[PDB]
Amino acid sequence: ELETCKEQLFQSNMERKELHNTVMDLRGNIRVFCRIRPPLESEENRMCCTWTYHDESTVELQSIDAQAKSKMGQQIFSFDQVFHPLSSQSDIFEMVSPLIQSALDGYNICIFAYGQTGSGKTYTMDGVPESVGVIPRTVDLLFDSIRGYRNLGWEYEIKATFLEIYNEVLYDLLSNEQKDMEIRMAKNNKNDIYVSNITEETVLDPNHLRHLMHTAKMNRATASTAGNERSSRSHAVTKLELIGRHAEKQEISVGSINLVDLAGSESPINRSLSELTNVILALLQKQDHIPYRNSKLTHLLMPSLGGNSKTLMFINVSPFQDCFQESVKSLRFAASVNSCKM
Amino acid sequence: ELETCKEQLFQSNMERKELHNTVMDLRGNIRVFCRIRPPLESEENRMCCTWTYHDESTVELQSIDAQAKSKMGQQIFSFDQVFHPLSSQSDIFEMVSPLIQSALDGYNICIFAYGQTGSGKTYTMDGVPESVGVIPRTVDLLFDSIRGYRNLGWEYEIKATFLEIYNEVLYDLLSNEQKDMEIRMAKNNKNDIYVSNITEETVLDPNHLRHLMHTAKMNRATASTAGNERSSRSHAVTKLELIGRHAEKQEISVGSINLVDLAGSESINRSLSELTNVILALLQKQDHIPYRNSKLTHLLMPSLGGNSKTLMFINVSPFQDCFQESVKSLRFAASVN
Ligand SMILES: Nc1ncnc2c1ncn2[C@@H]1O[C@H](COP(=O)(O)OP(=O)(O)O)[C@@H](O)[C@H]1O
Ligand SMILES: Nc1ncnc2c1ncn2[C@@H]1O[C@H](COP(=O)(O)OP(=O)(O)O)[C@@H](O)[C@H]1O
Ligand SMILES: [Mg+2]
Ligand SMILES: [Mg+2]
């Protein structure tokens, strides 16, 4: 008879699962966001732009130059939402926690931080000890959720791997034992991908994972020091694969989260950056063929840009005049996107 | 030990509830549908119209009068869905069943069948012993759901009341004791309404209620028999009130289902017209809704409110001679969304 609790507990969750993917689907599946960051004490003598916020999801930006102002015309863009200099980390996390539950439910996620250097990706994805980013929160939420699922029969296992992509070249950031990795078809799924030779530790709790994350950062030997042309010009893919198994019932749940702290989008490899973009738009257009294998980064995420996959995308921008010319570019991508979702 | 687990059930269900309403919301909350009925053996020599189906949620009608249709511009309308002559009762019910869940979760529902006489309203809401309508299936679905809910701690209680509105006059279809009934502010909710003197039976199962529905139908002894300007000119409000109580937790769930079998739409109309206004008035987020301008809009005031969910069926006849009317029916729909 208590089977009727556990069995119906198995059933309410099954229904909860569909309502949620349905909500997810109507809401989007490929949402684009914008994040604007407050200027720093070391930029108090820096020139801004004029941020006009027409409604909670649209924003127009204008060059404080009254002269150039004439030939530029208009600069107005909308998104599924917009975050302004007073928007907290916890704010941005609201837009993400749902996708986290989708992964536990068996769907692949992809959160990308994108923008020109200085914009705020690293701050967004990782954050800082004072105000943690998406990844740190994602982990806590992940372990909380997992904890509960036990009472339902599901035993979850997390499998983390951390790497970097610098010039169409992959780097395990968990080992210094310099090897040669390759993106290849997963043995039990020609559609899933697998990286050969990566360190794939199985997280034991927020701790063990915070560590691993630290390690990955160090081994990144982040020479943001001298000629940093490296870190600001390379992709950082953190992947957590969630494997849920229900014995005495069978069937498993497999969903993966891919937290990409993208390279800076500025100008004078871009092989990926550009390629990544094409792929994204190519989907929105239900295009027949997506060039996933045209770049190490799209090949690697191929299985999470798929059909049921859900993608977040943050465009970070600096509220500064000198940036402006870039700041606009970052947004245009956002504008070119939603023009396809039409 | 169950006290750590079953609580997760009340806790789980709770979240299902929150999500369903979220889906309901994005979907609509106020959806307008369209049903076209196929011609009968007694209409084989009747003139149809040109039913163009541009996509599964849009359709264009046209006067076979190459003469008239060349003088009108067009005849095109889209709904949240459209059902054609081949659409079954079970099809329509799929559009409804979700709202039945909302009811049990504590929201107010309203299903309206609407159109010119002879279009399909009575068929849709009540149906026939062969192909039952929305109301019959709502009761079955309502009792199944209830039956499972027990295991979650909730005890549900249904409370039916059937009435008719003829000329801004309310008739209790469950008693022949001819009394005077009034619409007034509920005691424990000034926004809620309560009719005085209505028989309010507490349904015990599909039977008890099917019975009551029959009674209600007999006690309707309309003039459709001898002077149809009656039945086909009055409103039939069936109302099931769902009250769920969770003891050893407190908290109750109060929701109602209002099944309205509207009166013919051809140009009394005090209500039918008013009803229309009110509907549209909501889609426009208007400041003040004139709920008390008609007997129907005042009875349903609480089930058209904020959270409230509303389904609107516009039945139409596939006939040339109905044409001019069939377009008016669709214009209302053209303005809703
Ligand atoms: N939202 C913010 N609030 C406060 N400081 C921020 C914010 N966003 C970015 N910063 C600051 O600037 C730095 C973050 O780097 P970032 O702009 O993420 O990299 P890139 O755009 O080169 O990938 C941090 O040292 C942090 O103090
Ligand atoms: N979908 C249908 N399939 C078969 N018969 C139908 C259908 N719709 C309506 N009818 C028929 O016509 C009658 C229904 O009346 P109705 O058109 O609902 O009323 P009004 O439009 O006057 O409110 C029934 O006797 C039924 O046989
Ligand atoms: Mg950075
Ligand atoms: Mg009728």
User: How far does the centroid of ligand 4 lie from the alpha carbon of residue B313, in Å?
Assistant: 13
Q: Could you confirm whether domain B1-337 is CATH 3.40.640.10?
A: no
Please give the angle made by the CA atoms of A27, A28 and A33, to the nearest 5 degrees: 100
Q: Which residue of B has its CA nearest to A2?
A: B2
Name the residue at shortest CA distance from atom 1 of ligand 1.
Answer: A37
**C-beta separation of A118 from A318 below 8 A:** yes
Phi/psi at B42 (nearest 5 deg)? -95, 25
Q: Which residue of A has its CA nearest to B24?
A: A23
Residues of A in contact with B20 (CB under 8 A): 19
- Closest ligand 1 atom to A40 CA: 5
Helix (H, G, I), strand (E, B) or coil at B279: helix
User: How far does the centroid of ligand 2 lie from the alpha carbon of residue A27, in Å?
Assistant: 38
Cross-strand partners of B242: B158, B255
DSSP result, B149-171: HGGGTEEEEEEEEEEEESSS-EE
- Give the C-alpha separation, A119 to A330, whole Å: 10
Helices (H) and strands (E) in chain B, counts: 9, 12
| Determination technique used | X-ray
**C-beta separation of B33 from B315 below 8 A:** no
Name which of A2, A19, A26 is nearest B16 (Cβ-Cβ): A19
Q: Which of B17, B23, B101, B149 to mutate to test the interface with A (most CBs of A within 10 A)?
A: B23
If we measure between CA atoms, which residue out of B165, B151, B155 comes closest to residue B271? B165
Name which of A8, A20, A148 is nearest B9 (Cβ-Cβ): A8
Is the C-beta atom of B119 inside 6 A of ligand 2? yes
- Give the C-alpha separation, A285 to B295, whole Å: 51
The sheet with strand B108-114 has its strands ordered as B82-83, B30-36, B309-316, B108-114, B252-261, B235-246, B154-165, B170-172
**Is A118 known to sit in a ligand binding site?**
yes
Residues of B in contact with A4 (CB under 8 A): 151
Please give the angle made by the CA atoms of B265, B195 and B219, to the nearest 5 degrees: 60
Name the residue at shortest CA distance from atom 17 of ligand 1.
Answer: A120
**C-beta separation of A170 from A163 below 8 A:** yes
**C-beta separation of B113 from B262 below 8 A:** yes
Helix (H, G, I), strand (E, B) or coil at B33: strand
How many CB atoms neighbour CB A15 within 10 A? 15
Q: How many CB pairs under 8 A join A and B?
A: 48
Cross-strand partners of A306: none
Residue A287 CB partners (closer than 8 Å, separation 6+): none
Instruction: Reduce the secondary structure of chain A to three states and give it as a string.
Output: CCHHHHHHHHHHHHHHHHHHHHHHHHHCCECCEEEECCCCCCCCCCCCEEEECCCCCEEEEEECCCCHHHCCCCCEEECCEEECCCCCHHHHHHCCHHHHHHHHCCCCEEEEEEECCCCCHHHHHCECCCCECHHHHHHHHHHHHHHHHHHHCEEEEEEEEEEEECCCCEEECCCCCCCCCCEEEECCEEEEEEECCCCCECCCCHHHHHHHHHHHHHCCCCCCCCCCCCHHHCEEEEEEEEEEEECCCCCEEEEEEEEEEEEECCCCCHHHHHHHHHHHHHHHCCCCCCCHHHCHHHHHHHHHCCCCCEEEEEEEECCCHHHHHHHHHHHHHHHHHHCCCC
User: How far does the centroid of ligand 3 lie from the alpha carbon of residue A117, in Å?
Assistant: 6
**Is A296 known to sit in a ligand binding site?**
no
**C-beta separation of A134 from A93 below 8 A:** yes
Handedness of CA A204, A209, A211, A212 (dihedral sign): positive
Name which of B2, B4, B16 is nearest A12 (Cβ-Cβ): B16
Helix (H, G, I), strand (E, B) or coil at B246: strand
DSSP result, B36-59: EPPPPGGGTTS-----B--STTEE
Name which of A20, A22, A151 is nearest B8 (Cβ-Cβ): A151
Q: Which residue of A has its CA nearest to B2?
A: A2
Cross-strand partners of B185: B193
User: How far does the centroid of ligand 4 lie from the alpha carbon of residue B235, in Å?
Assistant: 9
Angle between helices A206-218 and A134-149 (to 10 degrees): 150
Is the C-beta atom of B37 inside 6 A of ligand 2? yes
Q: State the smallest CA–CA distance between residue B243 and chain A in angstroms.
A: 22
Chain centroid, CA A108 distance in Å: 11
Chain A residues with CB-CB distance to B under 8 A?
2, 4-6, 8-9, 12-13, 15-16, 19-20, 22-23, 26-27, 148, 151-152
The H or E element containing residue B32 is strand B30-36
Q: Which of A13, A16, A20, A102 to mutate to test the interface with B (most CBs of B within 10 A)?
A: A16
If we measure between CA atoms, which residue out of A18, A13, A35, A16 comes closest to residue A312? A35
- Give the C-alpha separation, B84 to B159, whole Å: 34
- Give the C-alpha separation, A258 to A113, whole Å: 11
**Is A116 known to sit in a ligand binding site?**
yes
Q: What is the CATH number of domain A1-342?
A: 3.40.850.10
- Give the C-alpha separation, A334 to A127, whole Å: 23
Residues of A in contact with B15 (CB under 8 A): 16
Whether residue B4 and residue A152 make contact (CB cut-off 8 A), yes or no, is: no
Chain B residues with CB-CB distance to A under 8 A?
2, 4-6, 8-9, 12-13, 15-16, 19-20, 22-23, 26-27, 148, 151-152
Residue length, chain A? 342
Resolution of the solved structure (Å): 2.9
Name the residue at shortest CA distance from atom 24 of ligand 1.
Answer: A123
Is the C-beta atom of B117 inside 6 A of ligand 2? yes
Q: Which residue of A has its CA nearest to B17?
A: A16
- Give the C-alpha separation, A220 to B243, whole Å: 61
| Residues of the binding site of B for ATP | 115-122
Give the tokens for residue A320: 């500064």
- Closest ligand 2 atom to B87 CA: 1
Q: State the smallest CA–CA distance between residue A75 and chain B in angstroms.
A: 30
